[PDB]
Symmetry: C3
Subunit: 109 residues, 3 copies
């Protein structure tokens, strides 16, 4: 049909510039239809025996399940951290016409 | 069975008034139990031969799977773009009383 | 290398509740990692009117396994008596991150 299986991928980054550049390569390389950047996140995790807290930005990446591999590759290749967060969540339904656009926007995999 | 299959729906909108109103209109019309508005989000995508970027906000809408078509029709009717982002994600539980109030406060 | 995991959305009513609940969450070994999204605005129906209040959003990355522990932990340290805690199924990613996620949390 019109309309490949899709996902929403969260990826966090340390700063504003990083976020904007990653969104550019993702979209230019045609690995996602669309990227929302949520600025001014604060992140909390346990590392080196204390609780750590860092200023970060969240990228919300609408794309194909197909490309989750090409995407995840791509985030690591382009990312200040060694273990960069990237997790996909499945899109089950939506505005049909947008999901088609999502398909046409995206690399063939 | 005090609990119906539920979704998180994402909708971007182009400005602060817009989403405030979409949200009002959505909730009023009983098409979702609630809407979180995330403001100041930047959206990047490919459009007319290059990398467009727009200032928007994000509506995270918690409603029932049953209501996704009604909610998607509503969003189109009340939204500036022709092909608005509306995408659904399935909930695999959580606070059961939340999930029932979700059921209850929705049609 | 990798137990079934999830993202958990949870709103708190202010800057401070979030900092504190994110701490106490990560402190008691309950999720690998917590993102606070400040200054969101939450709109819902309540007592016959459209309510709007300012809030924050915790995005909580953990294993399905801890969902209930977590929920029950939040209800303990959460000033609302019916917190929004909903969960969406993680289904893919940095195989590495998922391992770190796994390797940062309990079983029960």
């Amino acid at each position: 049909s019109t309309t490949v299986p899709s996902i929403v991928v969260y990826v966090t980054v340390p700063n504003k510039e990083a976020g904007k550049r990653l969104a550019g390569s993702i979209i230019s390389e045609k690995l996602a239809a669309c990227v929302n950047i949520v600025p001014g996140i604060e992140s909390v995790y346990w590392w080196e025996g204390k609780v750590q807290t860092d200023a970060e930005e969240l990228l919300i990446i609408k794309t194909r399940e197909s490309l989750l591999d090409a995407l995840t590759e791509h985030v690591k290749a382009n990312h200040e951290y060694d273990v960069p967060e990237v997790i996909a969540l499945p899109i089950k339904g939506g505005n049909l016409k947008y999901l088609e656009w999502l398909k046409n926007s995206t690399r063939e995999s």
